[PDB]
Amino acid sequence: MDIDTYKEFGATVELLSFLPSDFFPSVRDLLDTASALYREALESPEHCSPHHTALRQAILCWGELMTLATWVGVNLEDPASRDLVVSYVNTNMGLKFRQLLWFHISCLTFGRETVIEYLVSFGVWIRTPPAYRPPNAPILSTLP
Amino acid sequence: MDIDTYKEFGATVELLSFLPSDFFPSVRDLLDTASALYREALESPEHCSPHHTALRQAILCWGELMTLATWVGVNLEDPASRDLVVSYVNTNMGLKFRQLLWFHISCLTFGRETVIEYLVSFGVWIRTPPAYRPPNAPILSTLP
Amino acid sequence: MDIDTYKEFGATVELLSFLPSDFFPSVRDLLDTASALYREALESPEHCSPHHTALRQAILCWGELMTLATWVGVNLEDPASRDLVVSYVNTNMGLKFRQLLWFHISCLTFGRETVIEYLVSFGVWIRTPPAYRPPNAPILSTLPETTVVR
Amino acid sequence: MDIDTYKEFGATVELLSFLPSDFFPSVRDLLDTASALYREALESPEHCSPHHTALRQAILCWGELMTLATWVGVNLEDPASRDLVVSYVNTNMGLKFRQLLWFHISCLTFGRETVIEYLVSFGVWIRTPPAYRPPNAPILSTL
């Protein structure tokens, strides 16, 4: 049906692939961040935000992928093929989910506009030669 | 996080258990329904509604599941066992997705209150022994 | 015909000749930056700005150049000549495109006036011997110096 | 990306594919026309029109493509290969740029809308079977 989840939030897969895949934190770390900062609101019976809804759906989808993959690896005979599957998931869907969770957590925490400006700025930065840029990478911070 | 997607929309995973598993249409049929009725809105850059958001996310996760399963079967040379994983996938992830699509397409087409009342009444009907069970089961509709 | 593309935008090639070649992001980086920030406009049916127009024309010409050079390489069985051909394309036209892509993106982002002032100051800095200039080149950036967003 | 240069000017490549590839005047003729008519404006420090902008960029591009090709031929030892490569440029690079140079000059000279109508009418003419095709092909004219 050709749908982009980021398009409603003013983003795009093109805009998030603008950042390196070695940038987005791990799914464990992001799920922990969420459980810590917005558990009482994700488990809540309220449409608190589109970001909340999307995060719920995304956490559930990661669970549906991990369960399938565990059942699979259990069935497969070769731990080698098991690790091949693991690499495939972690590099193909793991990245998508890292992007998704990062985007939505970051938005809830800082601001959608803040996060998009951060995307463009960090992309231009990491693409710019070091001698002609600020030496310290950008970062998002609630601390003044 | 023990999040239930329906809890936000006033339902629960156990209220939909009022309906059997053989009740829900095929993913194919429900995706066709969506493409027919709410394609322009799902593909929209707007948060038209939580149902739209959730349904977009749901389609993306089904694509992630199908992609993994197909890649697995293809990179595999013994497909006779592929029927086992297909059966597992359907029986589990497939039923969850059929329950998720139906809820949302219905709550868009008819209404959330209407759908919850339908669930209650269908639970009555199907709890009723067949000897005293009318044949004119309840059905969601916009006609008399 | 003696045409300077920059003249229309208040600049020249003498104001950008100072900028070293190590100043410009590689073409792919600059095509990615244009795609990420202005794809919805460049792909639009509107004349939103002379910068958009020039970026469109520049992207098309790079594409034609790449199509000629790849064909040439495929026709060259000597990878040494292929490397010599690539080195020519990267030094003569890759630099020209890198400068043209940078100028227009930077203008769209910051302001043509700001970009020209930056060019003036960078020329002051680069014309200056190292023994007498600061070691940290002037910087054009949307972020503050700390690089922390809130 | 999916950029069409003519899309901003209210056109496409599907609307210029109407005109046969051998319709477009040669690059030399099209540059002489541009010089004569709009040298003082293409060399101007002014955004007189998007057509001027695009035409400047196209001229600079042809120059770069001719520079690469001359260098290549010079560094090339086989005259047959040299002729083949220059033929390739003429068929693929020469066409795109001559189609671009024509569009913009004709627009500057007659009108964007006039040129689009000309494209449509010429498509009619060239679709017409020859027995009913007038020999007086369509042509752009001011007088």
From Swiss-Prot, chains A, B:
Localisation per UniProt entry: Virion; Host cytoplasm
Keywords carried by this UniProt record: Capsid protein, Cytoplasmic inwards viral transport, DNA-binding, Host cytoplasm, Host-virus interaction, Microtubular inwards viral transport, Phosphoprotein, Repeat, RNA-binding, T=4 icosahedral capsid protein, Viral penetration into host nucleus, Virion, Virus entry into host cell
Keyword DNA-binding: yes
Single GO biological process annotation from the record: symbiont entry into host cell
PTM characteristics: Phosphorylated by host SRPK1, SRPK2, and maybe protein kinase C or GAPDH. Phosphorylation is critical for pregenomic RNA packaging. Protein kinase C phosphorylation is stimulated by HBx protein and may play a role in transport of the viral genome to the nucleus at the late step during the viral replication cycle.
Molecular-function annotations in GO: DNA binding; RNA binding; structural molecule activity
GO CC annotation: host cell; host cell cytoplasm; T=4 icosahedral viral capsid
Subunit (UniProt): Homodimerizes, then multimerizes. Interacts with cytosol exposed regions of viral L glycoprotein present in the reticulum-to-Golgi compartment. Interacts with human FLNB. Phosphorylated form interacts with host importin alpha; this interaction depends on the exposure of the NLS, which itself depends upon genome maturation and/or phosphorylation of the capsid protein. Interacts with host NUP153.
Family: Belongs to the orthohepadnavirus core antigen family.
Function: Self assembles to form an icosahedral capsid. Most capsids appear to be large particles with an icosahedral symmetry of T=4 and consist of 240 copies of capsid protein, though a fraction forms smaller T=3 particles consisting of 180 capsid proteins. Entering capsids are transported along microtubules to the nucleus. Phosphorylation of the capsid is thought to induce exposure of nuclear localization signal in the C-terminal portion of the capsid protein that allows binding to the nuclear pore complex via the importin (karyopherin-) alpha and beta.
Name used for this protein in its record: Capsid protein
Species in which this protein is naturally found: Hepatitis B virus genotype D subtype ayw (isolate France/Tiollais/1979)
Organism lineage string: Viruses, Riboviria, Pararnavirae, Artverviricota, Revtraviricetes
